[PDB]
Amino acid sequence: TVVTQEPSFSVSPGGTVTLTCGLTSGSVSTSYYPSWYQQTPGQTPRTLIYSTNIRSSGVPDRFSGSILGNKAALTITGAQADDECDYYCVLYMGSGIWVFGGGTKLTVL
Amino acid sequence: DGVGSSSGNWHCDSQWLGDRVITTSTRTWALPTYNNHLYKQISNSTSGGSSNDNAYFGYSTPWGYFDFNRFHCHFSPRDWQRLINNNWGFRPKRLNFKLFNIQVKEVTDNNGVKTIANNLTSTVQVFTDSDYQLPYVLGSAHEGCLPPFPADVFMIPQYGYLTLNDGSQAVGRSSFYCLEYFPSQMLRTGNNFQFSYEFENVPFHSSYAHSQSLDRLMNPLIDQYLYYLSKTINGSGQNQQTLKFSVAGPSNMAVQGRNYIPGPSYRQQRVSTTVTQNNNSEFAWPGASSWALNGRNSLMNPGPAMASHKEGEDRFFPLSGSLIFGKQGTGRDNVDADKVMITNEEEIKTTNPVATESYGQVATNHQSAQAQAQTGWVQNQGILPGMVWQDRDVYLQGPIWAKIPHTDGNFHPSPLMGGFGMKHPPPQILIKNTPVPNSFITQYSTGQVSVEIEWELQKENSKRWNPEIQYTSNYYKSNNVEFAVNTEGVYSEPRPIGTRYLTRNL
Amino acid sequence: DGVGSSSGNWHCDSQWLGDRVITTSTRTWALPTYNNHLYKQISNSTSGGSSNDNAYFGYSTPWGYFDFNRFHCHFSPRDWQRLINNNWGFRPKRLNFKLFNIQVKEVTDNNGVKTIANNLTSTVQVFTDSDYQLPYVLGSAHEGCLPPFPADVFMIPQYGYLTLNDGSQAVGRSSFYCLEYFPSQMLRTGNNFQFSYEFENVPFHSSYAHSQSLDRLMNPLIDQYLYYLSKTINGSGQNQQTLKFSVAGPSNMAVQGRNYIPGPSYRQQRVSTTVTQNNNSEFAWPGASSWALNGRNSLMNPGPAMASHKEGEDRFFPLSGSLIFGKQGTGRDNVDADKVMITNEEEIKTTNPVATESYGQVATNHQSAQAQAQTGWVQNQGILPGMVWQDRDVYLQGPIWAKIPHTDGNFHPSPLMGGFGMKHPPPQILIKNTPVPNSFITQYSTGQVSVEIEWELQKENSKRWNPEIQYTSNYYKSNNVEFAVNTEGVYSEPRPIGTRYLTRNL
Amino acid sequence: DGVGSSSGNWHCDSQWLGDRVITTSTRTWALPTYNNHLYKQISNSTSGGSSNDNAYFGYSTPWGYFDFNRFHCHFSPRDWQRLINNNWGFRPKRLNFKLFNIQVKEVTDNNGVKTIANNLTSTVQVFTDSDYQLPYVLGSAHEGCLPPFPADVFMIPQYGYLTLNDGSQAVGRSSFYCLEYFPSQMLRTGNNFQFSYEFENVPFHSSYAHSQSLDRLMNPLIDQYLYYLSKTINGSGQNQQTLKFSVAGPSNMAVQGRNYIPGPSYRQQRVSTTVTQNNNSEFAWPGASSWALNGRNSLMNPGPAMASHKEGEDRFFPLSGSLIFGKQGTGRDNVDADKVMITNEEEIKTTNPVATESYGQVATNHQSAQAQAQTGWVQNQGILPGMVWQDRDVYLQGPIWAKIPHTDGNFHPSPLMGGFGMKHPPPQILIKNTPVPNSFITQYSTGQVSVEIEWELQKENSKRWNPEIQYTSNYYKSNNVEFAVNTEGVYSEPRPIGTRYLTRNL
Amino acid sequence: AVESGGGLVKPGGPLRLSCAASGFSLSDNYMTWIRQAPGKGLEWVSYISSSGSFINYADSVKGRFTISRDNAKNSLYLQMNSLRAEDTAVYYCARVLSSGGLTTSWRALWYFDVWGRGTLVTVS
C-alpha cells in the first residue's frame, strides 16, 4: 500500500503534460477514490480535484483529471505559469486511512 | 315583492342537538364598483414585478364574491370551546345560503359634497357556479372573509384569476373567462336569493392528541421472541469479528420490532424565536425549502404535516413550516415577532417526524474487511408501506375546505393548510352591480348575507381515569376580556386556537 | 359449414353514437409455421448474449398471438382528430373479436419450382387464455400488432415468454408452460371463431391540458392573511439578527401558502438534439437512470410521468424519459436523429415537475451562530400527502392497456407508457397450424380478423371564451398527403399525435 | 351448575372442509397474582436504564391477558404443511373463544413448607375490550403466547402499558387507565366464559412465489417498436458528438421500456455470517438504519419488505432486515449465531429490491459541453406511481395479525412484521384473580382455554407443466424426529417455516 | 465561509494541540489530521467519525497518539504522546467531506476540503 507517482515533470508554458499516479500493490479505479492537491509554497495545500473527473469550484478547466489506464492521473492541457507548484496524490482505502504520493513539482520554461 | 316590506330576517344562533351542530351567522356588506365595469388584463409588468418566480398572467373582473371559508365566521369562540373540548371529530354536512335586504345606492358627487341617494329600479346580478367551470380562488386562504364579529360591516373582495404564462406574456393555451356568459339571477331592492348545498362525504377531521407515542406501543414488562444483533466484536484486537444476538426487551426498547413507522418528512430550516441564536446572515429566501415547477421556484408552505419542534424546545419553529396569523392591527409589512401568532404542531409529535430533524439514517455502503459500515442522514422520505401520519390541525382562524385539483391522480388529498379536501367544494357566489349609464353613475349596493352549515360530531368515548386537558381562559385579571372589543370598539382575538385537546390511545 | 360460402364479412367503420364510440377494424393475416412445431428452450448463451444485465431464460412456442393493443389499429387519423378535439376523456367499455374465413395452404417444393395448394383437412387451433394462467406479454409494447392501414396484410408474431433465470441457467422455481395442455378449438376452412369480452371498470383517460399551473391558483388581487418570514437581519454589520414577518401577497407570489404540491420526480439526464451542446463523451449507458433489481441494472424507461422540458426550451429531452417512435422505413440499429420521432410531455408541465430539473431544495442542517443555513437539491422525491400529478399521455401509435402484475400491493397502477391499467386485460388469443405428418407437410394459413371495441366518452363542458387549441393539417403544398400512401403504396405516419389539446381549469 | 360437573370439554383438531379451514386449540393455563394486587408506576428510573433512546413511562397492572396472536398456536406443523403446499392464499373469517374449568388454588406456607388447597368461594374476573378503549399490546409480538405443543401448560403474561413521556417524567397529556373501571364477568369454579368474534375484511395473505421477475415480463422473440439512445459519439477524437437510436429488442433487454417498476426501498447494512468478511470495528448500533422520532432514535426493524440477498449469495443478511427466531432453549443474552434462526426473504427478489443494495441511480446535473453527465446512487426511494411489491411473508412462528393505529392516514397498512392489518383486531381478553383479604391470601388459578378460528383459502389454479416446489421433511435419519420431542420431552421447532412455495405468473 | 486554525505547542515535547472550529460544527463533519515533514511529504495521521464511534490511525502513530473531539467548544484535540525525533514535522487540521451528495441521490467521494494553516511541532 504505497502510492506511486513520478517526481519529475517539467513543462514549458503553453504545454500540457499528464501526471500519472498509481498504486504499486493494486490497480486503481473509482472505488479507490483518487484526488489531486496542489501545494503552493508559503501556503496551505488546496485540493486541485477530487473523485476522478469532478473539478473543485476554485480550479480552472485548463487541466482535466481522469482515470486513464490502470492508474488514474491528472492531465494538464496547455500549462501556464500560475498552476505550477508541488502536487500530491492520494487515494482513499479501507476505513479512515489515506496514503499520499511522493510529490511532484512542474516548471514553466 | 315590494320595497316597503322586509325580504328577510336576522339569523344568528347555534343549535347544539345530539351529535349534530347547526351554526347560523348573518352579516352586513357593501359592494363597490371595480374597474369601471371592465375586464382588464393584469400581469407582473402592470404592477412592475421584476423577478421571474413572481411572473404571472391573468385577468381582473368586476365581479365580487363571498368568502365564508374561514372557521371563525361560523363558530363563535364559546361554541368553539364547547366543540373542541367535548368532541373527537367533526365535519360539515349541509350548506344553506340566503342573500336578502338588497339596498342599491346612487351617488352624485359635486365639487365639495357627495349626495348619497337610493336607486329603486337598479338591479344586482348574482349567481353561483355549481358546474365548477370557473377558476376556483377560495382555496388559497385569501383575506376578505366574513368578519368574526357579527356587528362588523365588511367589503366584498374583487374576483380575479390567473392562467398559463411564459414570462409576463400569455400562451395560446391560456384561457379567458367572461363571467357575463353565465346565467345570473338579477335582484332589485325587493328580491332575495337562496340556495342549498350538500357537502360530499369526507372523513371526520381528527380532533385529538395521541396518548401513546408510536415508538412506545409495545408492552413494557414482556420480552419479545425476536432477536437483534447485539455485538459485532468480542473486544479490541486483531480479527475479533463475531456475531452475537440478544433478546429485544424492556431493558433496550429502541431495537424492538415494530409494525408501523412514522410518516414522511421534508426538512424545513429551523428558525429560533430568540434572535441571538439565529445565524447572522440573510437566510430567509436562500435557506428555505421549496419545490420547483416549470423553472419557477415556489416556497414550500406550509408543507407536509410535521411536528414543529422536539419535546422541551418551544422556542424553535420551522422556517416556512407553520401557519402564521397576524394579531389585530398588525401591519402589512415587516412586523416583528410579537405582532404575529405562530402555530406549533407539537400535538402530532407522536406519529410524525419533527420537521426540523432528519427522518433517520440509511446505510450507504457494504461493509467489508477494508470498509467500515457507513450511514447518512435522510433529509426527505416519501411514503413507505406501513407509514401512519397525522394531518395538520385546523384553527379558529384557519380555512375550512379546499378544492382538490382535478387530475389523473392524487394521494391523501387533504389540503396542507388544514381542513377538508373535496372534489366539489361549496360553490363560489359571484355578485356585481349592473352598470347603469362608457359614462356611468357612481353606484354601490348593500344588504345581508346569512350562511348556515350543519355540522356532525363524534362523541368522546374514552375511559381515561385522570382528567383531560381542556381549553380554558385564565382567571388573572386583564384590562380587556379576550375575544371582545376594547374601548374603541375594535374586536380582536388574542391567540390562535388549536382543535386538539382530548386524547386517544394510539 | 361449407367451402363454397364465406364465414363472415368485411367490417371497417366507426359509429359515433351519443357519448359512445364503436370502432371496428378488419385485417387480412398470415400465420406461418414456427420452430417447425417444437418447443425450444432459449437463453442468453444459446443466442450468445454476454452481458450479465441481459441474461434471460425462456421458451419459444409454435403458437402465435393476435395483438391489437395499439391505438392506430382501432382508429383512423380522422377518427382520432374527431376524438381528441371534442372530448375530455375516453375509455374502452366492450370488446368483440371475430375470426373468419380460415384458409390452409400446403406448399409443395420441387427443384424447379414451388407450388402452393390449399389443404382442406388441416385445421387451425385457436384458444384464449380467459383465466390468465399463461404469462402475459401483450403489455410490453412489442412489435407485431395489427397494421395501421387496412389494405396491408400482416403476419402474426410468434409467442414466447421468459421465466426465472440465474445468469445463463434456469432455476428450480421456473415453470415451463405448455400451450397444448389448455383446451383449444380446432377450425376447418368452413369454421369461424368469435368471442366477446367485457372490459373491467377503469378511470377515464385524461385528455386535456390544464390551463392553470399548480402554483398560480391564487387570486391575483388579494393578500392572504397568512404571514411569511421576510428578513432575518436588519442590515450589513455585526449582531444584526432579527425577525421580520410580512403578508404574502400578489406582489411576491412565490412565498404564499399552498394546499397542494406537484407530483413525484425521478430525474433523467438531459440530452440536446443539437449535438454541439452535448458533452463529447459516451454517456448513453453510463449517465442513464436505472432501477437495480436482483443485481441486474434495468434502464428506467420511460419512468414516472414528468414534463419533458422547461417551457421555452424544446430542444432538450430526457435521455430515457420519452416514448420514441420511428418514421416509416427506419432502420433497426443506430439510425440518425431524424429517422425517429420523439414525443414531448410539455402539456403536463402545469402539475408535474420537469424531468430534467431538481424537484426542489431541503435544508441539510440546523442554523446557529457558527453555522450557516445549508441546502441541498432533491434529485428524486417519493409520494407525499397532498401531491397531484398527470399520467403520461397516449398516442395514436402508443399502447392502449397493460396488465397489472398480480401482487399484494401496488400504487396508481396506470402503466408508465400510458393507457389504462387493468388487472384483467383483454385475454391473449393463441393460434397455430396443426401439425400434419418429425417430417411434416410445409404449411401456413391465412384469413380475416375483425375486432370491435366500444369507447365511452366524456363531453366538453367548458365555458372558455377564446378559441381552443386544435389539431389541424397544414394547408401549404406538399408532395404527399400526410397519413396516406406514397407512389409505391407505403403507408407513412409523419409525426406522433398526442391526445391533449383541449383545456380545463385546475 | 355445580362443582362436581365439568364446565367444558377438550377440543384440539383441525377440519379441512372444501375451501375453508377450522382450527381449534385447547390449552391449560396458570395465572399467578401480579404486583400483589396493585397498580404501579413504571419508568426507566425504576429499572435504571440511562440511555435516552430507552426512556419510557408507563403503568404495570395486576391483570393478565391471553395472547394467541402467533400461528403455531392454531396450526400443527402437519396442518401448516398441508396449508402452504396446496393454497395460494388464506385469511381468517371467524373467531370463537371459550374459557372454562376454573380452578382456584390457595397457597398457605408454613415455615419451610407450602400447602395447596382449592378455594370454592374465590372468584376470577374476566372481560374483553370491544371498544378498544384500552391500549392494544398484542401487536408487538411479545412472548407468553399459547405454547406450540398442546401438552405444555403455560403462564399467562402480565399486562402493562405505556404513555407519553419526557425522560422518565410524564406530561399532562399522559393517560392512566384503571382496568377495574370496565364491567367484567366474574367466574367461580363452576362458571364458564365465551364470546364470538368476526374478522373484518382483509386481503388474502399471498402464499406463493412469483416465477417471472419484473424486468423480464417481455417476449424474447419480438422487438419493441420503441427506440433508445445507443451512441452519443462516433468514436475517439474531438467534436465527435452524435445521436444514434437503436431498437429495444431481446438482444439487449436491459434498455427496453417497461410498464412497471419495483417497489420502494430503505437500505439496510449488510452483515455476513462468515465472520472474517465482516468489518473489524463495532458497527452493530452505529451503522444500523434507524428512524428518528421526537428526538429518540429507533432501529428500523424489520423494515419495509425487501429481498434479503442477491441470488447466489445467501451468506449475507440485512443487519436489521429480517426476523430472527431463537432455537429451543436459546439463552437471553449474547447467544451465538447458530443458536438463532435468521429468516431470509429470497422469494420476493422478483418484484422487490435487495435490502442491502441501492434502488438505482438518478442524474445529478445537466450534462453539457463543459461538464460530463453524472449520477448519484439512491439509498431510499419512496413510493412512485406504478410500483408493485410483495409484503413480508409469515412463518409458523410469526405473528398472525396486528392492530392498525387509529390515524388520519396510512398507506398499505399491512404490518411490517407480517400478517394481516386490521383496524378492529380480535379484542384483548383480560383476566385476574379477585383479591381476597393490604393483607391478602396468596392465591392463583388454572383452567382451560379453547380458541377456534375459521380460515378461508384460495385454491391453486396453475397450469404449470413441471412439478411445484413443496415443503418436505428429510428422509435421512436423525437422533430426533423433526418437530417432535426429545428424550427429555422438550418440544422444539427445527427451523422457521415460510409460507411461500407454490409459483404463480407475475 | 468555513475555515479554522490549529493549536500551537512548544517544540520538544508531547502535547495535545487543538483545532478550533469556525464556520462549521465538528459534530456532523469527518475530521482528519495531516502531518507534513518540512520539504518532503504529506502523511495521513488520524481520522475520526462525525459520531466519533469510528476512529483509525496511521501505523506509525497508531497505538501512540489519541484523538478527542469536543463539540461544545468547537475544538478538535489530538493528543500526541511519547514523541520520536521522526515525529518532527508540520501538522494540518484537514476537513474531509464524505459523500457530499444528498441521500436520495448520493455519491461517495473522499477528499480534504478545508485546510487549517500548518504549525510546526519539533521533537527535541
Numbering used by the authors:
A (entry chain L): 22 to 130
B (entry chain B), C (entry chain A), D (entry chain C): 219 to 655, 668 to 736
E (entry chain H): 23 to 146
Article sentences:
The AAV vectors are composed of non-enveloped T = 1 icosahedral capsids, consisting of 60 viral proteins (VP), and package single-stranded DNA transgene cassettes. A major challenge for the utilization of AAV vectors in the clinic is the presence of pre-existing neutralizing antibodies (NAbs) in a large percentage of the human population. The presence of pre-existing neutralizing antibodies in large portions of the human population poses a significant challenge for AAV-mediated gene therapy, primarily targeting the capsid leading to vector inactivation and loss of treatment efficacy. This study structurally characterizes the interactions of 21 human-derived neutralizing antibodies from three patients treated with the AAV9 vector, Zolgensma®, utilizing high-resolution cryo-electron microscopy. The antibodies bound to the 2-fold depression or the 3-fold protrusions do not conform to the icosahedral symmetry of the capsid, thus requiring localized reconstructions. These complex structures provide unprecedented details of the mAbs binding interfaces, with many antibodies inducing structural perturbations of the capsid upon binding.
